[PDB]
Amino acid sequence: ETIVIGLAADSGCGKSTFMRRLTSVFGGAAKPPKGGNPDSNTLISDTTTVICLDDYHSLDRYGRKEQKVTALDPRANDFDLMYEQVKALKNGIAVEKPIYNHVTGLLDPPELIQPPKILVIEGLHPMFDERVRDLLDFSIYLDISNEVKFAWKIQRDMAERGHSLESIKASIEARKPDFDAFIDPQKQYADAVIEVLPTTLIPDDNEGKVLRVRLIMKEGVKYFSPVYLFDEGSTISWIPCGRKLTCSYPGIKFNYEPDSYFDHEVSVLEMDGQFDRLDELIYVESHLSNLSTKFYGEVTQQMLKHADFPGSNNGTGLFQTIVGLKIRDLYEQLIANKATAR
Amino acid sequence: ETIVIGLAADSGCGKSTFMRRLTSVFGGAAKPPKGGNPDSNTLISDTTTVICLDDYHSLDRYGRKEQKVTALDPRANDFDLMYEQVKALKNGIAVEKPIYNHVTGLLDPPELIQPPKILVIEGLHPMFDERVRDLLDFSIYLDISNEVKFAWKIQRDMAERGHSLESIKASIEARKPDFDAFIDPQKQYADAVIEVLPTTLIPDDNEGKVLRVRLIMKEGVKYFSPVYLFDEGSTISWIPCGRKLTCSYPGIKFNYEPDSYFDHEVSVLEMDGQFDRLDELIYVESHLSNLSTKFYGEVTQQMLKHADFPGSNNGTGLFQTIVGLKIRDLYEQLIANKATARA
């Protein structure tokens, strides 16, 4: 009775630190299948196997170029195969999954995937097909706003330094139609959306370092008690920076509020600003509720295992870690019932 | 102490008349697994299990059309897994084997396969991988020629009647490279090859009923004493028809000669024509040597337990049956040696 997690993300197979945070919570070390194709996207842990959804492309790079179809387009993807093989793994049956090697852009011969305890499917289209969506036990959508997507390319993406800003936004133009038509709509099916926006604390900041990030959590979901702050259901702003907790400019600002998201009820926890000192993280964790921690400080402790990770100092790393614990709480209850259900 | 037989044929899993005749020699009756899956291709007998090699397909039927690669192509098959489960079966450890459902054309959930006394793997690629080739205690290749493959599509294959002659000949072409590249070279590794050609007794015959059939048998193989006619090693043409054995047209013609086949020494036994009367089969068996029969007429009696089978009146049925006995003789000496060794 293996558990399947969806993660809709745009950062490309292999460049998601969200995936690496979930992995550290779930198991030990995700390493490619020992021996075999060095271009394989699959990552295997003691508990978890991450599958890249590019592997189910129905069109290679030259293929897609021939049809002038992007990788965002459902035409370029085989959802029948994805659906059948996620189904088989969830029911304990191995699959021959084709490998999409990114260095050559060809659809490579398949690899034998063994059912794990936790299966995470990650890529552009995890929740696009209703049949695949019904197999997911939890659904995540990482929503990067266009404004920090562009900032991160300027401030961090070393490989696009060769391109000017005029052609980098002209790269975003020709990708937006396919993205908004086929990628963005998947948010409505996620149990947890993490939305990364520019910061409102310092005016006109476009650097992508200080971030306003929203954690949107679906209500009414079995085994998922959303995080809350002080008074669940209420609308709160909370600035912990004060006399007993000094912060540098511009500090930490929190918002907790209910909301309606795609005609679904959600509750939203927000963080704007970034942690100066570790005291601020510990103070923040000590005042949040329904974190699904097993001991005191696990959120902070789980983050300190990856102090080098991008976003370890703002709500991005804070909420991605919290999400991992919530999923762990869910699959513990989910396999607690299936253990007794034989 | 399990025996592994290789059977290379492109007629398709579940279409092998050759396989039916072998199981009748080897065991009681080959049935599908009890319960299991209605589309399972494994066949089970008291002595033998037949494993279709489509079950080790790595690419879906729908994926095969997506990547533009045929089923003859190794990229569409997982030989690592196939070698594992045959190495596992020969070494007597049971295995969960996947199922290729030809109806949906989908890679189905697996079925449990217990190590049998005799294990046969049949399909397009039993001798393709040297690893797998080293597990086989005997190797068979059924070489249907392109002129008989074509006639059979016309005269018998009812599903082809929707297609035109030009379309069928243009379909055979589009399959030939992968067959030339991946299937046909497996002939060199076979201990026994059966080759089906258009008959030479009727000029310009293209109907696939009267056939020239060659049984190619490797020499120097341990526990395999090839069939011979009258005088082993010599070059003989023998027409049994005469005063004492009246035949109908075009009659029977036998050829027996040594040959070199892929730089291996072989003996070749040939039959052209078809038995029009039952007396001729008995006459032919009475005059053949090294048949590995347990009693007089076992070749003929074994055939009559499948009178309906195609090729039951020509060299196709005669040689496929004789091949079964030769393997039975081989695995008994082969079992006796390792049964002796284990005590």
XYZ file of C-alpha atoms in Angstrom:
685
model
C 0.000 0.000 0.000
C 2.509 2.566 -1.249
C 1.894 6.302 -1.013
C 2.021 8.669 -3.991
C 2.785 12.392 -3.635
C 2.429 15.005 -6.372
C 4.720 18.023 -6.704
C 3.962 20.472 -9.506
C 7.079 22.569 -10.079
C 8.658 24.570 -12.892
C 12.319 24.540 -11.798
C 13.095 21.481 -13.931
C 13.779 17.874 -12.958
C 16.772 17.893 -10.613
C 16.853 21.571 -9.591
C 14.098 21.517 -6.937
C 15.351 22.148 -3.413
C 11.730 21.716 -2.320
C 12.148 18.101 -3.432
C 15.399 17.838 -1.470
C 13.747 19.173 1.688
C 10.903 16.656 1.410
C 13.493 13.925 0.813
C 15.477 14.783 3.951
C 12.281 14.552 6.002
C 11.103 11.355 4.306
C 14.305 9.305 4.210
C 18.068 9.337 3.912
C 19.822 10.137 0.622
C 18.206 10.206 -2.812
C 20.714 8.730 -5.261
C 20.141 7.594 -8.864
C 19.626 3.858 -9.480
C 22.945 2.195 -8.639
C 24.418 1.279 -11.994
C 22.514 1.893 -15.199
C 21.841 5.030 -17.169
C 23.800 8.038 -15.813
C 21.171 10.312 -17.398
C 18.299 8.781 -15.415
C 16.209 11.347 -13.560
C 14.991 8.848 -10.962
C 16.130 9.414 -7.373
C 15.956 6.533 -4.896
C 16.048 6.679 -1.088
C 15.552 4.138 1.687
C 11.931 5.344 1.849
C 11.314 7.447 -1.262
C 11.614 7.319 -5.046
C 11.304 10.581 -6.987
C 10.077 10.265 -10.579
C 10.605 13.060 -13.092
C 7.515 13.637 -15.215
C 9.639 14.478 -18.257
C 10.247 10.713 -18.445
C 6.658 10.371 -19.718
C 7.172 12.793 -22.613
C 5.447 11.595 -25.780
C 7.792 13.709 -27.922
C 11.550 14.159 -27.835
C 13.345 17.503 -28.108
C 13.574 17.204 -31.914
C 10.094 15.678 -31.825
C 8.688 18.685 -29.980
C 10.711 20.976 -32.242
C 9.235 19.233 -35.281
C 5.672 19.843 -34.104
C 6.597 23.298 -32.684
C 5.118 22.148 -29.381
C 6.606 23.063 -26.010
C 7.260 20.733 -23.093
C 4.349 22.427 -21.273
C 1.917 21.210 -23.927
C -0.138 18.097 -23.052
C 0.471 16.930 -26.628
C 4.143 16.440 -25.733
C 3.252 14.128 -22.821
C 1.897 10.586 -22.533
C -0.674 10.685 -19.734
C -1.971 7.168 -20.399
C 1.460 5.712 -19.620
C 1.938 8.036 -16.636
C -1.479 7.060 -15.271
C -0.977 3.319 -15.790
C 2.484 3.294 -14.212
C 1.669 5.466 -11.191
C -1.285 3.110 -10.696
C 0.902 -0.008 -10.823
C 3.454 1.394 -8.369
C 0.706 2.428 -5.938
C -0.524 -1.187 -6.032
C 2.971 -2.598 -5.504
C 3.809 -3.467 -9.126
C 7.035 -2.432 -10.846
C 7.015 -0.662 -14.217
C 9.337 -0.266 -17.194
C 9.507 3.532 -17.207
C 11.207 5.244 -20.172
C 14.050 7.620 -19.326
C 14.106 11.173 -20.677
C 17.790 12.060 -20.850
C 18.138 15.845 -20.877
C 21.655 16.099 -22.320
C 20.560 14.597 -25.662
C 16.808 15.233 -25.617
C 15.998 11.722 -26.861
C 13.556 9.269 -25.308
C 15.933 6.626 -23.957
C 15.206 2.946 -23.331
C 13.244 2.403 -20.120
C 14.392 1.609 -16.589
C 12.853 -0.836 -14.110
C 11.250 1.133 -11.262
C 10.526 -0.689 -8.030
C 7.584 0.387 -5.850
C 8.808 2.450 -2.886
C 7.237 3.273 0.469
C 6.735 6.859 -0.753
C 6.474 7.766 -4.437
C 6.854 11.421 -5.398
C 6.046 12.376 -8.978
C 7.446 15.790 -9.853
C 7.362 17.948 -12.951
C 5.140 20.165 -15.047
C 1.982 18.044 -15.184
C 1.461 15.954 -12.003
C -2.190 16.913 -11.424
C -3.242 17.676 -15.008
C -4.906 14.315 -15.727
C -7.898 13.449 -13.551
C -6.921 9.768 -13.459
C -3.410 10.568 -12.209
C -4.867 13.125 -9.801
C -7.040 10.476 -8.129
C -3.954 8.385 -7.307
C -2.256 11.200 -5.371
C -2.467 11.043 -1.581
C -1.188 14.633 -1.284
C -0.666 17.371 -3.863
C 1.819 20.263 -3.831
C 2.120 23.223 -6.206
C 5.121 25.553 -6.024
C 3.967 28.857 -7.531
C 6.814 31.218 -8.387
C 5.508 34.624 -9.384
C 6.833 36.003 -12.659
C 8.676 38.791 -10.822
C 11.051 36.600 -8.773
C 11.251 34.020 -11.559
C 12.885 36.842 -13.516
C 14.916 38.065 -10.532
C 16.323 34.595 -9.829
C 17.477 34.381 -13.449
C 19.325 37.689 -13.038
C 20.789 37.207 -9.557
C 21.397 33.439 -9.413
C 21.096 31.740 -12.826
C 24.752 31.828 -13.877
C 23.979 30.106 -17.182
C 21.767 32.945 -18.462
C 24.325 35.696 -17.818
C 25.070 35.301 -21.528
C 21.577 36.594 -22.335
C 20.509 40.213 -21.993
C 17.415 41.210 -20.030
C 15.506 41.998 -23.236
C 15.823 38.400 -24.459
C 15.238 36.875 -21.011
C 11.791 38.453 -20.719
C 11.301 37.637 -24.403
C 11.963 34.067 -23.255
C 9.191 34.419 -20.666
C 6.740 35.785 -23.265
C 6.717 32.759 -25.587
C 6.444 30.421 -22.570
C 3.579 32.210 -20.795
C 0.692 31.042 -23.074
C 1.484 27.364 -22.519
C 2.215 27.926 -18.826
C -1.019 29.758 -17.991
C -3.115 27.374 -20.092
C -1.671 24.078 -18.905
C 0.492 24.555 -15.824
C -1.039 27.276 -13.668
C -4.568 25.722 -13.548
C -3.220 22.748 -11.538
C -3.099 24.866 -8.354
C -6.790 24.215 -7.666
C -6.051 20.522 -7.080
C -3.168 20.974 -4.629
C -3.552 20.380 -0.914
C -0.653 22.800 -0.345
C 0.332 25.701 -2.599
C 3.494 27.640 -1.775
C 3.479 31.003 -3.541
C 6.672 33.076 -3.695
C 6.224 36.826 -4.245
C 8.377 39.961 -3.956
C 8.613 41.468 -0.489
C 6.336 44.306 0.648
C 8.603 45.244 3.591
C 11.279 47.068 1.551
C 9.893 49.127 -1.359
C 10.759 48.300 -4.969
C 12.888 45.255 -4.128
C 13.564 43.037 -7.146
C 16.505 40.982 -5.878
C 14.717 37.744 -4.968
C 16.437 37.464 -1.577
C 13.806 38.944 0.756
C 10.510 37.269 -0.134
C 6.802 37.271 0.676
C 5.820 33.596 0.515
C 2.294 32.275 1.135
C 1.461 28.741 2.293
C -2.047 27.942 1.029
C -3.492 24.868 2.752
C -6.725 23.150 1.741
C -9.331 22.727 4.472
C -11.534 19.673 4.915
C -8.768 17.290 3.820
C -8.591 14.026 5.759
C -5.422 13.673 7.881
C -4.352 17.260 7.055
C -4.790 19.736 9.911
C -3.457 23.029 8.486
C -0.889 25.080 10.358
C -2.322 28.025 12.274
C -1.092 30.993 14.306
C -2.480 31.973 17.727
C -6.195 31.647 16.875
C -7.200 29.235 14.114
C -9.716 30.742 11.706
C -9.004 34.385 12.550
C -7.216 37.052 10.503
C -3.894 37.999 12.095
C -0.754 39.967 11.388
C 2.137 39.112 13.711
C 5.522 40.830 13.994
C 7.671 39.005 16.589
C 10.494 41.541 16.280
C 10.505 43.726 19.372
C 12.227 44.298 22.699
C 12.954 40.630 23.487
C 13.615 39.649 19.834
C 15.819 42.115 17.973
C 15.786 41.908 14.177
C 17.739 43.646 11.463
C 16.027 45.592 8.713
C 13.361 44.878 7.634
C 12.550 41.991 9.963
C 9.863 39.323 9.986
C 6.149 39.816 9.299
C 3.520 37.065 9.454
C -0.048 36.849 8.165
C -2.593 34.159 9.034
C -6.049 34.264 7.491
C -8.738 32.077 5.928
C -9.494 32.404 2.240
C -11.354 30.888 -0.704
C -9.052 29.416 -3.357
C -10.613 28.166 -6.616
C -13.987 27.884 -4.839
C -12.274 25.775 -2.155
C -11.824 26.755 1.478
C -8.209 27.299 2.529
C -6.280 28.887 5.365
C -3.195 30.920 4.484
C -0.012 31.381 6.510
C 2.391 34.016 5.188
C 5.928 35.141 5.948
C 7.446 38.359 4.624
C 11.085 39.128 5.347
C 13.943 36.842 6.271
C 15.575 35.506 9.426
C 18.616 37.468 10.547
C 19.636 35.217 13.434
C 18.655 31.684 14.398
C 16.860 33.086 17.468
C 14.124 34.379 15.158
C 13.479 30.965 13.602
C 13.270 29.252 17.001
C 10.909 31.948 18.287
C 8.714 31.635 15.184
C 8.445 27.850 15.475
C 7.649 27.997 19.198
C 4.570 30.141 18.467
C 3.082 28.194 15.544
C 0.547 25.398 15.953
C -0.324 22.209 14.071
C 3.214 21.839 12.738
C 3.104 18.004 12.859
C 6.478 17.918 14.601
C 7.482 14.891 16.656
C 9.760 16.825 19.032
C 10.285 20.453 20.002
C 12.266 22.358 17.384
C 12.098 19.761 14.607
C 11.230 22.398 11.992
C 14.352 24.395 12.872
C 16.377 21.204 13.352
C 15.257 19.835 9.981
C 16.290 23.132 8.373
C 19.736 23.247 10.005
C 20.591 19.975 8.241
C 20.601 22.069 5.052
C 21.823 25.532 6.055
C 23.409 25.769 2.592
C 20.053 25.344 0.835
C 18.608 28.377 -0.979
C 15.817 30.011 0.981
C 16.990 28.615 4.329
C 16.579 32.159 5.700
C 13.016 32.972 4.571
C 9.529 31.485 4.405
C 10.389 29.423 1.325
C 12.605 27.041 3.283
C 10.416 27.427 6.373
C 7.157 26.416 4.683
C 8.650 23.729 2.431
C 9.996 22.055 5.571
C 6.656 22.423 7.373
C 4.908 20.854 4.369
C 7.221 17.839 4.570
C 6.287 17.193 8.195
C 2.571 17.563 7.418
C 2.866 15.000 4.614
C 4.708 12.697 7.021
C 1.895 13.025 9.558
C -0.597 12.257 6.790
C 1.145 9.168 5.433
C 1.673 7.842 8.970
C -2.092 8.027 9.506
C -2.647 6.864 5.922
C -0.513 3.730 6.374
C -1.788 3.301 9.937
C -5.242 2.644 8.489
C -3.884 0.474 5.658
C -1.782 -1.548 8.111
C -4.967 -2.458 9.982
C -6.796 -2.719 6.640
C -4.253 -5.379 5.547
C 18.099 -28.966 -11.582
C 15.915 -27.327 -14.220
C 16.325 -27.546 -18.011
C 16.017 -24.457 -20.230
C 14.994 -24.773 -23.894
C 15.194 -21.884 -26.355
C 12.646 -21.576 -29.169
C 13.153 -18.694 -31.610
C 10.105 -17.951 -33.764
C 8.355 -14.829 -35.049
C 4.942 -16.475 -35.543
C 3.842 -15.006 -32.229
C 3.394 -16.282 -28.703
C 0.401 -18.601 -28.531
C 0.516 -19.329 -32.277
C 3.397 -21.834 -32.102
C 2.293 -25.193 -33.460
C 5.917 -26.152 -32.783
C 5.373 -25.524 -29.067
C 2.254 -27.704 -28.885
C 4.149 -30.663 -30.352
C 7.052 -30.228 -27.918
C 4.820 -30.160 -24.824
C 3.019 -33.336 -25.920
C 6.388 -35.095 -25.983
C 7.570 -33.438 -22.771
C 4.395 -33.503 -20.681
C 0.675 -34.178 -20.445
C -1.075 -31.012 -21.584
C -0.214 -27.309 -21.561
C -2.937 -25.170 -19.974
C -3.126 -21.499 -18.973
C -2.498 -20.759 -15.283
C -5.450 -21.524 -13.029
C -7.283 -18.289 -12.312
C -4.520 -15.734 -12.816
C -5.340 -13.515 -15.794
C -7.397 -14.437 -18.880
C -4.699 -12.848 -21.072
C -1.757 -14.644 -19.447
C 0.596 -16.158 -22.016
C 2.339 -18.635 -19.710
C 1.390 -22.239 -20.461
C 1.686 -24.868 -17.732
C 2.165 -28.631 -18.039
C 3.012 -31.278 -15.459
C 6.620 -31.247 -16.719
C 7.010 -28.007 -18.661
C 6.292 -24.297 -18.387
C 6.258 -22.188 -21.555
C 7.176 -18.523 -21.119
C 6.337 -16.101 -23.897
C 9.140 -13.608 -24.420
C 6.694 -10.777 -25.115
C 6.266 -10.758 -21.327
C 9.735 -9.161 -21.104
C 8.763 -6.321 -23.439
C 10.006 -3.064 -21.946
C 7.965 -0.806 -24.255
C 4.182 -0.598 -24.366
C 2.380 -1.293 -27.624
C 1.358 2.367 -27.494
C 4.859 3.425 -26.479
C 6.286 1.309 -29.305
C 4.343 3.449 -31.777
C 5.476 6.593 -29.923
C 9.231 5.919 -30.007
C 9.001 4.567 -33.597
C 10.721 1.271 -32.747
C 9.396 -2.190 -33.577
C 8.967 -5.172 -31.256
C 11.908 -6.972 -32.881
C 14.179 -4.174 -31.631
C 16.132 -4.857 -28.391
C 15.329 -1.331 -27.165
C 11.722 -2.566 -26.833
C 12.762 -5.450 -24.544
C 14.417 -5.752 -21.127
C 17.084 -8.447 -21.393
C 18.499 -7.657 -17.957
C 15.223 -8.767 -16.359
C 14.676 -11.662 -18.787
C 18.157 -12.995 -18.044
C 17.510 -12.581 -14.309
C 14.299 -14.598 -14.238
C 15.626 -17.383 -16.473
C 18.857 -17.533 -14.478
C 16.577 -17.548 -11.432
C 14.384 -20.345 -12.799
C 17.274 -22.530 -13.989
C 18.750 -22.114 -10.501
C 15.356 -23.018 -9.065
C 14.280 -19.782 -7.351
C 10.710 -18.757 -8.178
C 10.015 -15.423 -9.814
C 7.277 -12.846 -10.361
C 7.121 -12.450 -14.134
C 5.227 -9.561 -15.761
C 2.513 -10.212 -18.335
C 2.228 -8.669 -21.799
C -1.504 -8.525 -22.570
C -1.798 -8.632 -26.364
C -5.478 -7.621 -26.166
C -5.008 -4.250 -24.476
C -1.376 -4.185 -25.573
C -0.483 -3.196 -22.002
C 2.205 -4.302 -19.551
C 0.020 -6.135 -17.037
C 0.661 -6.963 -13.369
C 2.943 -9.979 -12.913
C 2.155 -13.633 -12.306
C 4.079 -16.039 -10.097
C 5.984 -18.706 -12.044
C 7.351 -21.732 -10.226
C 10.604 -23.287 -11.507
C 9.574 -26.226 -13.702
C 11.351 -29.427 -14.710
C 11.565 -28.107 -18.288
C 11.460 -24.373 -19.014
C 10.877 -23.168 -22.571
C 11.286 -19.518 -23.542
C 9.815 -18.833 -26.980
C 9.583 -15.629 -28.959
C 11.651 -13.241 -31.034
C 14.744 -13.043 -28.835
C 15.624 -16.199 -26.833
C 19.175 -16.338 -28.240
C 19.779 -12.604 -28.691
C 21.682 -12.088 -25.417
C 24.805 -14.165 -24.795
C 23.967 -14.252 -21.076
C 20.593 -15.835 -21.856
C 22.227 -17.948 -24.570
C 24.550 -19.515 -21.979
C 21.542 -20.681 -19.931
C 19.976 -22.647 -22.806
C 20.611 -26.394 -22.830
C 19.092 -26.605 -26.330
C 18.311 -23.937 -28.923
C 15.748 -24.096 -31.738
C 15.122 -21.623 -34.562
C 12.118 -21.820 -36.898
C 13.139 -20.143 -40.173
C 10.076 -19.519 -42.302
C 11.244 -18.166 -45.637
C 9.879 -14.915 -47.032
C 8.006 -16.707 -49.832
C 6.126 -19.046 -47.472
C 5.482 -16.325 -44.889
C 3.856 -14.393 -47.741
C 1.734 -17.252 -49.102
C 0.469 -18.101 -45.613
C -0.786 -14.533 -45.183
C -2.788 -14.996 -48.396
C -4.100 -18.548 -48.078
C -4.686 -18.857 -44.318
C -4.352 -15.562 -42.421
C -7.974 -14.380 -42.449
C -7.123 -11.128 -40.650
C -4.965 -10.054 -43.609
C -7.866 -10.249 -46.086
C -8.720 -6.646 -45.229
C -5.282 -5.624 -46.512
C -4.282 -5.604 -50.173
C -1.465 -7.647 -51.699
C 0.549 -4.484 -52.338
C -0.098 -3.349 -48.761
C 0.898 -6.742 -47.331
C 4.116 -6.943 -49.355
C 4.791 -3.328 -48.330
C 4.250 -4.351 -44.693
C 6.721 -7.244 -44.896
C 9.364 -4.804 -46.153
C 8.944 -2.383 -43.234
C 9.626 -5.268 -40.827
C 12.599 -6.778 -42.654
C 15.505 -4.651 -41.244
C 14.817 -5.463 -37.591
C 14.234 -9.083 -38.612
C 17.471 -9.106 -40.625
C 19.353 -7.287 -37.865
C 18.003 -8.891 -34.692
C 16.035 -12.098 -35.382
C 17.714 -13.907 -38.272
C 21.300 -13.849 -36.854
C 20.076 -16.044 -33.979
C 20.134 -19.008 -36.403
C 23.883 -19.447 -35.867
C 23.361 -20.309 -32.193
C 20.637 -22.930 -32.668
C 21.299 -26.631 -32.212
C 18.353 -27.380 -34.517
C 16.995 -25.152 -37.285
C 13.852 -25.999 -39.255
C 13.642 -24.152 -42.577
C 10.423 -23.953 -44.612
C 10.783 -23.159 -48.318
C 8.532 -23.271 -51.383
C 8.370 -26.733 -52.892
C 10.529 -27.741 -55.845
C 8.280 -30.654 -56.855
C 5.614 -28.340 -58.326
C 6.989 -25.518 -60.513
C 5.766 -22.029 -59.604
C 3.869 -23.123 -56.490
C 3.227 -20.284 -54.050
C 0.455 -21.619 -51.822
C 2.350 -22.765 -48.721
C 0.663 -26.189 -48.602
C 3.305 -28.267 -50.414
C 6.607 -27.306 -48.820
C 10.335 -27.999 -48.836
C 11.410 -28.420 -45.203
C 15.028 -28.624 -44.018
C 16.011 -29.893 -40.559
C 19.471 -28.483 -39.794
C 21.194 -30.261 -36.894
C 24.461 -29.178 -35.287
C 27.212 -31.775 -35.001
C 29.480 -32.247 -32.009
C 26.739 -31.340 -29.517
C 26.828 -33.424 -26.345
C 23.799 -35.732 -25.898
C 22.498 -34.731 -29.364
C 22.941 -37.466 -31.979
C 21.478 -36.020 -35.205
C 18.962 -37.876 -37.334
C 20.441 -39.667 -40.339
C 19.134 -41.617 -43.330
C 20.634 -44.960 -44.422
C 24.309 -43.957 -44.117
C 25.319 -41.125 -41.795
C 27.567 -38.516 -43.381
C 26.785 -39.325 -47.018
C 24.814 -37.268 -49.563
C 21.531 -39.008 -50.410
C 18.359 -38.227 -52.323
C 15.620 -40.753 -51.568
C 12.160 -41.049 -53.124
C 10.186 -43.637 -51.099
C 7.389 -43.791 -53.674
C 7.400 -46.906 -55.828
C 5.784 -50.264 -56.517
C 5.214 -51.085 -52.841
C 4.263 -47.557 -51.657
C 1.965 -45.707 -54.060
C 2.012 -41.930 -53.604
C -0.191 -39.211 -55.014
C 1.227 -36.243 -56.888
C 3.731 -34.727 -56.364
C 4.885 -37.393 -53.931
C 7.704 -37.393 -51.407
C 11.361 -36.522 -51.936
C 14.002 -36.744 -49.213
C 17.493 -35.252 -49.105
C 20.246 -35.971 -46.583
C 23.651 -34.288 -46.779
C 26.348 -32.778 -44.559
C 26.852 -29.031 -44.629
C 28.612 -26.115 -42.962
C 26.208 -23.650 -41.352
C 27.537 -20.398 -39.862
C 30.980 -22.068 -39.702
C 29.496 -24.940 -37.666
C 29.295 -28.478 -39.009
C 25.725 -29.708 -39.491
C 23.739 -32.546 -41.000
C 20.671 -31.624 -43.050
C 17.582 -33.804 -43.430
C 15.069 -32.505 -45.966
C 11.568 -33.353 -47.117
C 9.789 -31.896 -50.138
C 6.139 -32.708 -50.772
C 3.448 -33.885 -48.390
C 2.127 -37.225 -47.201
C -1.081 -37.877 -49.102
C -1.621 -41.226 -47.342
C -0.901 -42.375 -43.803
C 1.171 -45.356 -44.988
C 3.934 -43.043 -46.223
C 4.621 -41.487 -42.817
C 4.965 -44.961 -41.293
C 7.225 -45.961 -44.186
C 9.381 -42.854 -43.728
C 9.806 -43.357 -39.978
C 10.600 -47.041 -40.533
C 13.590 -46.034 -42.686
C 14.959 -43.118 -40.621
C 17.693 -43.529 -38.011
C 18.572 -41.785 -34.736
C 15.006 -40.710 -33.996
C 15.394 -40.955 -30.186
C 12.133 -42.898 -30.010
C 11.210 -45.007 -27.007
C 9.213 -47.431 -29.166
C 8.495 -48.275 -32.790
C 6.309 -45.650 -34.421
C 6.426 -43.133 -31.565
C 7.089 -40.381 -34.121
C 3.922 -41.308 -36.021
C 1.764 -41.989 -32.951
C 2.834 -38.698 -31.356
C 1.755 -36.916 -34.542
C -1.681 -38.554 -34.700
C -2.501 -37.135 -31.256
C -2.659 -33.777 -33.084
C -4.146 -34.682 -36.468
C -5.777 -31.257 -36.839
C -2.490 -29.357 -36.555
C -1.173 -27.381 -39.541
C 1.690 -29.025 -41.369
C 0.688 -32.429 -39.996
C 1.042 -33.944 -43.495
C 4.421 -32.471 -44.514
C 7.978 -32.178 -43.184
C 6.980 -29.312 -40.889
C 5.021 -31.577 -38.551
C 7.422 -34.490 -39.037
C 10.547 -32.520 -38.130
C 9.050 -30.471 -35.285
C 7.920 -33.732 -33.680
C 11.301 -35.419 -34.189
C 12.970 -32.352 -32.664
C 10.882 -32.847 -29.525
C 12.089 -36.425 -29.094
C 15.716 -35.371 -29.590
C 15.354 -32.821 -26.788
C 13.631 -35.439 -24.627
C 16.575 -37.772 -25.200
C 18.936 -34.893 -24.438
C 17.332 -33.721 -21.196
C 17.127 -37.299 -19.877
C 20.849 -37.883 -20.363
C 21.315 -34.301 -19.134
C 19.138 -34.930 -16.083
C 20.789 -38.297 -15.461
C 24.248 -36.704 -15.394
C 23.366 -33.997 -12.867
C 21.120 -36.364 -10.908
C 24.112 -38.713 -10.774
C 26.272 -35.720 -9.841
C 24.010 -34.626 -6.982
C 23.798 -38.006 -5.218
